[model samples]
Target: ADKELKFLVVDDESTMRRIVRNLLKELGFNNVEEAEDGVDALNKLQAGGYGFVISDWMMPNMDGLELLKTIRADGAMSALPVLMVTALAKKENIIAAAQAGASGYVVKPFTAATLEEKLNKIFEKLGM
Candidate 1:
């Protein structure tokens, strides 16, 4: 059941999105979904039952930080697991995301091992 957990991948680039989707699938998550940006991601989230979100930091019309804040602010999804995926790997940025309710943070150019480690850590913490 843990391996089948549903995930939402939000990114502006089709290539990046595909990479994440395939990686999640290979990681044993069969129910991976995608969104082009925050707005689209939010819309898909409204449909319900998603277990996690992996979102890119910079995007047009609702970046990942904003998306994380919005998810935290929304009563319906306030406790949802959100993993920030960003190229902005600054210490301050990571700290800000920690303050903004990001369950995990992954710097870009990550490997399969890192991705698995982050998601597994989140799941363990959340008891998922």
Candidate 2:
């Protein structure tokens, strides 16, 4: 995997964003940015060069699921790696996210190990 790959962390909570950013740093991914919600994320994504996304499920402007669908539908970013980091831990929700084309799914309050593992899994699947 490329350690220089950029990551976008989307969450309404500042604390969650910080936690994810720090975790990504710990995992040797230092090129990271933050967005408050899906709308903000999409704006940044369209601006360019974001290789991956770690997003929360619930947010004010646009939710993560919707963001995932939007990204999947967009030809330019359809294949961008999106890992849902959410508190919503239902089987149906997982199924929905998978169907929406999420590269990976991680529940909220996740450990650094879990985040690293999921990211590595996505990278492996994408042959990054």
Candidate 3:
């Protein structure tokens, strides 16, 4: 399933991006691209054909919440699958992400199985 999916990974830290990339690869998603921040992510999204997005909340240029809002606001790409892969564990933040139409929410420093579960849940919900 992951083979057919292309993921966009957004974060400010190179180490975090590499770690997530490796984890995603392990989960059978090898078609992944990395971005330094939300602005870069948005630009990449404009290039098209990305099926999923994994983003960190605290990034420069633009934050995850803002990025998610932008994606939701865009008519053509509003249905894109977005997963919040961030360290922001606040209850309000989680609720906000869900209310803003996030497909999945994953706290930082997570494990492989947890990511698998989150991705599967999003996939099932989206009927993908």
Candidate 4:
């Protein structure tokens, strides 16, 4: 994966954002930014230069699901890979998430090694 690839971490919880940021940082990704909710994420996204997204399932102002849908429909970054992150380990949300827009999905309470594996897989899938 490109070390310079900028990452957008979207979540309502400050701790969750920090954890994800730390995981990325440990994996050698220093170009990371965070947004508190989907609306803030959208603003940052439209501002441009982001290469990837890791978002939570639920958020204020807008949900991650809608963000992913909107991202799939927008320009210049419509196909931008989004990894929908959630604590739900159930099959229902997984099925819904599988519908579209996630370059991939990762269940929460994950390890850096797992994220590294997923990140490399997405890089391979997108030919990055």
Best by TM-score: 2
Report every candidate's CA lDDT.
0.91, 0.93, 0.91, 0.89
Model 4 stretches astray by more than 4 angstroms:
none
Candidate 4: tens digits of C-alpha lDDT, residues 1-128: 88899999999999999999999998889999999988999999989899999999889899888889889888777888898888877888877877866787889888878888888899999999
Candidate 2 clash pair list: none
* Residue range 56-117, candidate 1, lDDT tens digits: 98988898899999999999999999998889899999999999999999999899899889
Q: Which residue pairs collide, candidate 4?
A: none
Clashes of each: 0, 0, 0, 0
Model 2 lDDT on a 0 to 1 scale: 0.93
**C-alpha TM-scores of all predictions:** 0.95, 0.97, 0.95, 0.95
Residue 19, candidate 4: Cα error in Å is 1.0
> Which is the leading candidate under lDDT?
2
Off by over 4 Å in 1: none
Error of 4 at 100 (Å): 2.4
Ranking by TM-score: 2, 1, 3, 4
